[PDB]
Amino acid sequence: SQDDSQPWTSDETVVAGGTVVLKCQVKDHEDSSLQWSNPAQQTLYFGEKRALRDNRIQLVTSTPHELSISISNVALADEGEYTCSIFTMPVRTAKSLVTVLGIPQ
Amino acid sequence: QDDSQPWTSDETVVAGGTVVLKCQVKDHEDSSLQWSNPAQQTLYFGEKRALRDNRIQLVTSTPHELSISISNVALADEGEYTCSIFTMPVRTAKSLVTVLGIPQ
């Protein structure tokens, strides 16, 4: 079902130690801010404003249509569903499943 | 015991009434305070509003205090609201909001 106030993001699969990029986009922001929260649902970025304090996480892009952040040196603990929320009326959310894999053989 | 550890108290209200959520911190380390609901949805990040709910107003937002109110309270409002201070590491304080029914 199409909805312009519904942002979209994408799953990401990375090897432990790698870098992940969580990208969220929205076509009609209704003058509401984008937010990225982690698997424990802790706020990572509210707009361009950093929240949870973690040196590996950095703001890549923040426009009213896009909120994108990166996580360098990815760890098993980073695994899970990250939610991108747009606080329009009513709220819409999009999830990005981050999967962390170890090294084989 | 920590200066940067926020605190708030529980609020018991009668359905239809108003509940005020008040959180404070002694030393904010220049870190934002944020209220989230029982579903963990951001309600207010600093003075910036998040979830859209006509009933929720900002009572006051300073670097040591963040208070919001929820008018015309309902059962769907019951739960643990969390007040977070995004210092390093993060600190939280749960506020259990209990909504009471009316006898008879």
mmCIF file of C-alpha atoms in Angstrom:
data_model
loop_
_atom_site.group_PDB
_atom_site.id
_atom_site.type_symbol
_atom_site.label_atom_id
_atom_site.label_comp_id
_atom_site.label_asym_id
_atom_site.label_seq_id
_atom_site.Cartn_x
_atom_site.Cartn_y
_atom_site.Cartn_z
ATOM 1 C CA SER A 1 0.000 0.000 0.000
ATOM 2 C CA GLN A 2 1.443 3.379 -1.171
ATOM 3 C CA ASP A 3 1.781 6.214 1.401
ATOM 4 C CA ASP A 4 4.008 9.307 0.935
ATOM 5 C CA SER A 5 4.259 9.942 4.661
ATOM 6 C CA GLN A 6 5.648 6.369 5.019
ATOM 7 C CA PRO A 7 9.466 6.308 5.006
ATOM 8 C CA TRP A 8 11.400 3.325 3.678
ATOM 9 C CA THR A 9 14.812 1.968 4.587
ATOM 10 C CA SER A 10 16.605 -1.287 3.781
ATOM 11 C CA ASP A 11 17.932 -4.397 5.531
ATOM 12 C CA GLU A 12 21.728 -4.615 5.876
ATOM 13 C CA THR A 13 23.932 -7.660 6.471
ATOM 14 C CA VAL A 14 27.496 -7.123 7.617
ATOM 15 C CA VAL A 15 30.521 -8.941 8.862
ATOM 16 C CA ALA A 16 31.601 -8.280 12.441
ATOM 17 C CA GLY A 17 33.976 -5.324 12.357
ATOM 18 C CA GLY A 18 32.525 -3.835 9.187
ATOM 19 C CA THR A 19 30.518 -0.685 8.615
ATOM 20 C CA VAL A 20 26.773 -0.422 8.297
ATOM 21 C CA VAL A 21 24.728 2.379 6.844
ATOM 22 C CA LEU A 22 21.154 2.832 7.996
ATOM 23 C CA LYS A 23 19.333 4.897 5.379
ATOM 24 C CA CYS A 24 15.859 6.300 5.784
ATOM 25 C CA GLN A 25 13.926 8.325 3.269
ATOM 26 C CA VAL A 26 10.462 9.884 3.212
ATOM 27 C CA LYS A 27 8.574 11.639 0.423
ATOM 28 C CA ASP A 28 6.186 13.813 2.428
ATOM 29 C CA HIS A 29 7.555 14.748 5.865
ATOM 30 C CA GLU A 30 4.536 16.851 6.972
ATOM 31 C CA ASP A 31 7.042 19.081 8.764
ATOM 32 C CA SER A 32 7.845 16.295 11.235
ATOM 33 C CA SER A 33 11.336 15.056 12.145
ATOM 34 C CA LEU A 34 12.979 11.741 11.288
ATOM 35 C CA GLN A 35 14.377 9.537 14.053
ATOM 36 C CA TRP A 36 16.570 6.484 14.188
ATOM 37 C CA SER A 37 16.269 4.118 17.208
ATOM 38 C CA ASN A 38 18.156 0.833 17.829
ATOM 39 C CA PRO A 39 17.010 -2.731 18.715
ATOM 40 C CA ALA A 40 16.543 -1.918 22.399
ATOM 41 C CA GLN A 41 14.542 1.036 21.002
ATOM 42 C CA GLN A 42 17.020 3.645 22.279
ATOM 43 C CA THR A 43 17.057 6.943 20.339
ATOM 44 C CA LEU A 44 20.173 7.221 18.176
ATOM 45 C CA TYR A 45 19.381 10.443 16.262
ATOM 46 C CA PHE A 46 16.388 12.731 16.598
ATOM 47 C CA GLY A 47 16.732 14.764 13.465
ATOM 48 C CA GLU A 48 20.359 15.842 13.197
ATOM 49 C CA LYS A 49 20.605 15.645 16.990
ATOM 50 C CA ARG A 50 22.650 12.760 18.347
ATOM 51 C CA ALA A 51 21.217 10.832 21.218
ATOM 52 C CA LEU A 52 22.630 7.626 22.488
ATOM 53 C CA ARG A 53 26.364 8.289 22.904
ATOM 54 C CA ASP A 54 28.465 5.829 20.878
ATOM 55 C CA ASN A 55 31.606 6.939 19.024
ATOM 56 C CA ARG A 56 31.136 4.277 16.348
ATOM 57 C CA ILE A 57 27.834 5.808 15.290
ATOM 58 C CA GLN A 58 27.918 8.917 13.080
ATOM 59 C CA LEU A 59 25.445 11.112 11.224
ATOM 60 C CA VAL A 60 25.803 10.738 7.479
ATOM 61 C CA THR A 61 22.931 12.836 6.149
ATOM 62 C CA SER A 62 20.045 14.789 7.616
ATOM 63 C CA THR A 63 17.604 16.644 5.417
ATOM 64 C CA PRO A 64 13.842 16.841 6.013
ATOM 65 C CA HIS A 65 13.592 13.883 3.593
ATOM 66 C CA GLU A 66 16.519 11.763 4.715
ATOM 67 C CA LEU A 67 18.112 10.562 7.946
ATOM 68 C CA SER A 68 21.096 8.305 7.472
ATOM 69 C CA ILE A 69 23.633 7.133 10.020
ATOM 70 C CA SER A 70 26.569 4.773 10.062
ATOM 71 C CA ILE A 71 27.999 2.289 12.510
ATOM 72 C CA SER A 72 31.665 1.472 12.152
ATOM 73 C CA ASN A 73 33.325 -1.557 13.744
ATOM 74 C CA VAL A 74 30.051 -3.496 13.866
ATOM 75 C CA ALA A 75 29.571 -5.970 16.695
ATOM 76 C CA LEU A 76 27.255 -8.917 17.343
ATOM 77 C CA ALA A 77 25.535 -6.712 19.874
ATOM 78 C CA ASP A 78 24.519 -4.319 17.062
ATOM 79 C CA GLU A 79 22.298 -7.000 15.590
ATOM 80 C CA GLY A 80 18.607 -6.465 15.280
ATOM 81 C CA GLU A 81 15.865 -4.270 14.035
ATOM 82 C CA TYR A 82 16.478 -0.546 13.795
ATOM 83 C CA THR A 83 13.383 1.629 13.454
ATOM 84 C CA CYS A 84 13.203 4.841 11.474
ATOM 85 C CA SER A 85 10.315 6.938 12.727
ATOM 86 C CA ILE A 86 8.652 10.016 11.140
ATOM 87 C CA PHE A 87 6.481 11.910 13.640
ATOM 88 C CA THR A 88 3.693 12.859 11.273
ATOM 89 C CA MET A 89 0.044 12.532 12.294
ATOM 90 C CA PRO A 90 -0.234 9.627 12.737
ATOM 91 C CA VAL A 91 3.320 8.238 13.124
ATOM 92 C CA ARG A 92 4.809 5.942 10.472
ATOM 93 C CA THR A 93 7.791 3.629 10.993
ATOM 94 C CA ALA A 94 10.095 1.598 8.758
ATOM 95 C CA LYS A 95 12.506 -1.098 9.963
ATOM 96 C CA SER A 96 15.967 -2.103 8.911
ATOM 97 C CA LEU A 97 17.102 -5.542 9.984
ATOM 98 C CA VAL A 98 20.798 -5.451 10.721
ATOM 99 C CA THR A 99 22.420 -8.880 10.691
ATOM 100 C CA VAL A 100 26.010 -9.393 11.879
ATOM 101 C CA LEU A 101 28.014 -12.396 10.729
ATOM 102 C CA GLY A 102 31.292 -13.763 12.045
ATOM 103 C CA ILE A 103 34.300 -14.977 10.072
ATOM 104 C CA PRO A 104 34.158 -18.560 8.726
ATOM 105 C CA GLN A 105 36.318 -21.596 7.993
ATOM 106 C CA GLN B 1 23.955 7.503 43.573
ATOM 107 C CA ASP B 2 24.886 9.809 40.698
ATOM 108 C CA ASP B 3 24.398 13.462 39.901
ATOM 109 C CA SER B 4 23.638 12.617 36.284
ATOM 110 C CA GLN B 5 20.995 9.981 37.106
ATOM 111 C CA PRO B 6 17.510 11.474 36.492
ATOM 112 C CA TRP B 7 14.509 10.906 38.722
ATOM 113 C CA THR B 8 10.718 11.145 38.359
ATOM 114 C CA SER B 9 7.893 9.603 40.347
ATOM 115 C CA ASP B 10 4.900 7.471 39.469
ATOM 116 C CA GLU B 11 1.570 9.146 38.788
ATOM 117 C CA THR B 12 -1.775 7.601 39.621
ATOM 118 C CA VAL B 13 -4.688 9.309 37.943
ATOM 119 C CA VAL B 14 -8.432 8.847 37.492
ATOM 120 C CA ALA B 15 -9.446 8.285 33.885
ATOM 121 C CA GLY B 16 -10.503 11.593 32.351
ATOM 122 C CA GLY B 17 -7.994 13.450 34.487
ATOM 123 C CA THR B 18 -4.595 14.985 33.755
ATOM 124 C CA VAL B 19 -1.242 13.380 34.477
ATOM 125 C CA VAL B 20 1.922 15.433 34.704
ATOM 126 C CA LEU B 21 5.219 13.648 34.009
ATOM 127 C CA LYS B 22 8.142 15.461 35.664
ATOM 128 C CA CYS B 23 11.806 14.535 35.323
ATOM 129 C CA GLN B 24 14.933 16.185 36.692
ATOM 130 C CA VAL B 25 18.690 15.685 36.767
ATOM 131 C CA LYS B 26 21.265 17.509 38.906
ATOM 132 C CA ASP B 27 24.120 17.424 36.373
ATOM 133 C CA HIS B 28 22.901 17.058 32.757
ATOM 134 C CA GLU B 29 26.434 17.038 31.263
ATOM 135 C CA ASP B 30 24.785 19.080 28.519
ATOM 136 C CA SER B 31 22.829 16.097 27.426
ATOM 137 C CA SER B 32 19.238 16.107 26.356
ATOM 138 C CA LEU B 33 16.310 14.761 28.393
ATOM 139 C CA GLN B 34 13.625 12.721 26.549
ATOM 140 C CA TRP B 35 10.258 11.322 27.558
ATOM 141 C CA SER B 36 8.982 8.190 25.814
ATOM 142 C CA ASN B 37 5.712 6.283 26.325
ATOM 143 C CA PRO B 38 4.995 2.626 27.375
ATOM 144 C CA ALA B 39 5.569 1.535 23.762
ATOM 145 C CA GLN B 40 8.962 3.288 23.872
ATOM 146 C CA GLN B 41 7.837 5.964 21.398
ATOM 147 C CA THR B 42 9.497 9.323 21.763
ATOM 148 C CA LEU B 43 7.109 11.940 23.214
ATOM 149 C CA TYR B 44 9.573 14.844 23.614
ATOM 150 C CA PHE B 45 13.293 15.198 22.856
ATOM 151 C CA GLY B 46 14.345 18.342 24.665
ATOM 152 C CA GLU B 47 11.505 20.803 23.920
ATOM 153 C CA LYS B 48 10.991 19.258 20.487
ATOM 154 C CA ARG B 49 7.683 17.444 20.236
ATOM 155 C CA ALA B 50 7.555 13.947 18.786
ATOM 156 C CA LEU B 51 4.445 11.740 18.935
ATOM 157 C CA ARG B 52 1.398 13.606 17.784
ATOM 158 C CA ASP B 53 -1.277 13.481 20.445
ATOM 159 C CA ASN B 54 -3.374 16.569 21.008
ATOM 160 C CA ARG B 55 -3.652 15.605 24.678
ATOM 161 C CA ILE B 56 0.059 15.880 25.328
ATOM 162 C CA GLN B 57 1.499 19.303 26.088
ATOM 163 C CA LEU B 58 4.971 20.385 27.149
ATOM 164 C CA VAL B 59 4.813 21.787 30.677
ATOM 165 C CA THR B 60 8.364 22.975 30.772
ATOM 166 C CA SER B 61 11.766 22.203 29.311
ATOM 167 C CA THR B 62 15.022 23.348 30.894
ATOM 168 C CA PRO B 63 18.418 21.664 30.950
ATOM 169 C CA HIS B 64 17.651 20.211 34.409
ATOM 170 C CA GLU B 65 13.934 19.558 33.909
ATOM 171 C CA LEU B 66 11.495 18.134 31.359
ATOM 172 C CA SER B 67 7.828 17.952 32.273
ATOM 173 C CA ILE B 68 4.923 17.129 29.983
ATOM 174 C CA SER B 69 1.220 16.613 30.621
ATOM 175 C CA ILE B 70 -1.363 14.224 29.216
ATOM 176 C CA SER B 71 -4.926 15.450 29.459
ATOM 177 C CA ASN B 72 -8.105 13.429 29.394
ATOM 178 C CA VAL B 73 -6.200 10.303 30.438
ATOM 179 C CA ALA B 74 -7.379 6.850 29.312
ATOM 180 C CA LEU B 75 -6.559 3.194 30.099
ATOM 181 C CA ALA B 76 -4.660 3.018 26.833
ATOM 182 C CA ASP B 77 -2.275 5.424 28.570
ATOM 183 C CA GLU B 78 -1.294 3.114 31.412
ATOM 184 C CA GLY B 79 2.293 2.009 31.737
ATOM 185 C CA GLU B 80 5.894 2.871 32.252
ATOM 186 C CA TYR B 81 7.057 6.114 30.643
ATOM 187 C CA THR B 82 10.821 6.496 30.544
ATOM 188 C CA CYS B 83 12.836 9.617 31.109
ATOM 189 C CA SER B 84 16.240 9.403 29.472
ATOM 190 C CA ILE B 85 19.355 11.573 29.742
ATOM 191 C CA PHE B 86 21.632 10.901 26.826
ATOM 192 C CA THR B 87 24.926 11.239 28.665
ATOM 193 C CA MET B 88 27.720 8.693 28.257
ATOM 194 C CA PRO B 89 26.567 6.213 29.162
ATOM 195 C CA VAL B 90 22.806 6.727 29.120
ATOM 196 C CA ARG B 91 20.592 7.106 32.195
ATOM 197 C CA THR B 92 16.888 6.405 32.654
ATOM 198 C CA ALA B 93 14.112 6.634 35.207
ATOM 199 C CA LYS B 94 10.766 4.916 34.800
ATOM 200 C CA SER B 95 7.504 6.530 35.720
ATOM 201 C CA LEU B 96 4.630 4.103 36.167
ATOM 202 C CA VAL B 97 1.382 5.796 35.177
ATOM 203 C CA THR B 98 -1.691 4.019 36.638
ATOM 204 C CA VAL B 99 -5.143 4.989 35.389
ATOM 205 C CA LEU B 100 -8.040 4.310 37.733
ATOM 206 C CA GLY B 101 -11.642 3.490 36.926
ATOM 207 C CA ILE B 102 -14.549 5.261 38.628
ATOM 208 C CA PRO B 103 -16.573 3.375 41.317
ATOM 209 C CA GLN B 104 -20.248 2.743 40.374
#
